[PDB]
Design a protein around this ligand. Structure first.
Ligand code: ZN
Lengths: 487, 148
């Protein structure tokens, strides 16, 4: 600190200061006759009423904020800013490396002074900001920001000895910064920092899978609920967020085991016991937000059709779903139409193509196609992809299989013979193969039956793009898809 | 390739599939032809490399501009009118799960975003992050460490 201040007097004649208004470094620096460096925006929004005087030393400025210094103050503020950045990088490197060297934690009062040097307490004028680990006072953010660097560097130790310190930091942030605001974001940040700390204390530690499975099982079957304590509006102990993060990793492990379970064989009689304990835990408590977390993790790791395959009627993994979502779910759970990426002009033509599927009138697709901008290549792609998604949603489903053969291929073929939008002989030789199911991409014969759908979708999408796209940077790939003897 | 892309991007499975559909859809409306001077057979390495340079140009022009599109695509595909009745896409794909009546009450810790999912940070995501944020000038050692 006194290195910095004797540095500033060496730099620019006794005291480059931040502006008293903004509490930060000056932009377009105006100098008072009393050696004051202020912001230009702050002095134009401040000096124009009847306060032609000084905020700091109460000195009357005579004329106007006319002296700007285009020689001294930009390079002075530049050098002092480079110096404060280098010194704050120095301080954060020292508290990262030397204050936290080995497995024993530092003393109490040094941790208290680190947590107290984050605050810039009362000064006569916005009070009580939060700064980016600086040993100085003259750096500001005029919005209270909350980082996670000290939180991760305190939680490299055992959790049993750093509960009260982060708890006291939490009580300080609640009493001065986050009184009545969105505490959900800070609580999720704390849950994420504790779960990252347990990831580090398990993965960088050296122990086998059986001991960690036995101890998390012993956590499960001895879990007192106790949720009435840290519930209502403000009470959030670090033990409570540690319990929620620990059960989130238990459900993460259980969801990894279920994703392993569906893909392969039996789970060696001990992972079975762990999944049984996860089942007993989730069927004991009605805190089904954690079950929502389980289904969000399984939807994230594998896909939507994965939990659709879980959502059948007698699979022995049905307990991973809440009680209301299964009784009001039918067996006609159709698939997602990923081609709405085009948006608001493919949606109209696919709705009208579903209309011409259900009825026999085929002019509706032509009316929807003339109700669209964005011309001829994308329009042809919309029409061909709409025809694909309708004949695919018919042929896949067991109830309505082979529906355009029921006197309806005559109507769409009449639309082919009438409308010149797709009766180009390469588009036409594609479309004849797509109407009567004689395109050899539906018979891709992948026996997994979940990624098989995706592979069919990617193949017909890139074929639709290569046909409908009249583009130079598609001229090789067309030769890769229709002339392999010429390749 | 699909396993490596859903590892490599810090998304869900559906969102990485949405990224691939974005790049195939975006490579269509790019009508500006300045892709002259290469053989259309891929017969010489200069023609292949020039094709690579123009296709790298279009892929970077579309890969820079996806993070301002993917929440809007999640809103539109979340509000399509045949999956929205299915109660599995509401508890997952962009609706609050408070319509489920058998649930704990409105607490400060039982919001939906607190019981959301998030990434598991790996090396491939780091390699993706070094190439968008101009890793060749500022951070060279990490780029060469993740490369090999
Ligand atoms: Zn100022």
């Amino acid at each position: 600190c006194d290195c910095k201040d004797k540095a500033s007097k060496k730099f620019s004649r006794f005291g480059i200061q931040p502006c008293f208004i903004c509490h930060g470094d000056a932009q377009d620096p105006v100098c008072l006759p009393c050696d004051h460096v202020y912001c230009l925006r702050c002095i134009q929004t401040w000096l124009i009423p009847g306060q032609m005087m000084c905020p700091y030393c109460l000195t009357d400025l005579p004329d106007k904020f006319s002296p700007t210094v285009s020689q001294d103050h930009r390079k002075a503020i530049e050098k002092h800013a480079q110096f404060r950045h280098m010194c704050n990088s120095f301080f954060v490197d020292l508290v990262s490396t030397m204050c936290f060297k080995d497995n024993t934690p530092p003393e109490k009062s040094v941790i208290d002074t680190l947590l107290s040097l984050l605050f810039v307490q009362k000064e006569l004028l916005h009070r009580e900001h939060t700064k980016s680990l600086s040993p100085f006072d003259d750096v500001v953010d005029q919005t209270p920001v909350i980082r996670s660097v000290l939180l991760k560097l305190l939680l490299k130790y055992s959790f049993h000895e750093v509960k009260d310190y982060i708890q006291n930091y939490l009580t300080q942030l609640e009493k001065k910064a986050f009184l009545t605001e969105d505490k959900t974001e800070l609580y999720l940040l704390f849950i994420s920092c504790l779960e990252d700390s347990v990831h580090q204390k398990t993965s960088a530690g050296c122990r086998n899978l059986e001991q960690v499975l036995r101890e998390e099982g012993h956590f499960l079957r001895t879990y007192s609920p106790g949720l009435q304590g840290q519930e209502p509006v403000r009470i959030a102990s670090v033990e409570y967020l540690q319990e929620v993060a620990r059960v989130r990793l238990c459900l993460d492990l259980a969801a990894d085991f279920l994703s392993e379970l569906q893909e392969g064989s039996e789970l060696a009689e001990d992972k079975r016991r762990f999944l049984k304990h996860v089942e007993e835990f989730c069927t004991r408590v009605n805190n089904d937000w954690h079950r929502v977390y389980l289904v969000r993790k399984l939807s994230s790791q594998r896909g939507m059709e994965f939990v659709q395959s879980f959502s059948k009627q007698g699979h022995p993994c049905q307990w991973v779903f809440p009680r209301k979502v299964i009784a009001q779910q039918k067996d006609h759970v159709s698939l997602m139409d990923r081609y709405l990426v085009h948006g608001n002009e493919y949606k109209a033509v696919r709705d009208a193509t579903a209309k011409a599927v259900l009825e026999c009138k085929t002019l509706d697709i032509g009316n929807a196609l003339m109700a669209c901008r964005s011309p001829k290549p994308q329009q042809t792609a919309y029409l061909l992809l709409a025809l694909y998604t309708e004949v695919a949603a018919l042929y896949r489903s067991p109830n309505g299989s082979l529906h355009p053969e029921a006197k309806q291929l005559e109507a769409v073929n009449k639309f082919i013979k009438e409308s010149k939008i797709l009766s180009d002989p390469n588009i036409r030789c594609f479309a004849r193969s797509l109407v009567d199911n004689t395109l050899p991409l539906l018979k891709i014969r992948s026996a997994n039956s979940i990624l098989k759908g995706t592979v069919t979708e990617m193949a017909v999408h890139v074929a639709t793009i290569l046909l409908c796209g009249h583009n130079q940077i598609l001229k090789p790939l067309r030769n890769l898809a229709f002339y392999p003897v010429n390749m | 390739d699909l396993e490596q892309l859903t590892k490599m991007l810090g998304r869900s499975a559906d969102e990485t599939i949405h990224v691939v559909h974005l790049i195939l859809s975006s490579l269509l409306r790019v009508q500006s032809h300045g892709v002259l001077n290469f053989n259309a057979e891929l017969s010489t390495k200069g023609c292949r490399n020039n094709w690579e340079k123009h296709f790298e140009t279009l892929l970077l022009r579309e890969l820079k501009h996806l993070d301002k599109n993917l929440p809007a695509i999640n809103a539109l595909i979340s509000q399509d009118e045949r999956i929205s009745s299915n109660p599995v896409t509401k508890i997952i794909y962009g609706d609050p799960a408070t319509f489920l009546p058998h649930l704990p009450q409105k607490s400060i810790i039982h919001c939906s975003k607190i019981w959301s999912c998030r990434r598991k940070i790996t090396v491939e995501y780091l390699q993706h992050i070094v190439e968008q944020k101009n890793g060749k000038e500022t951070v060279p050692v990490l780029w060469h460490f993740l490369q090999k």
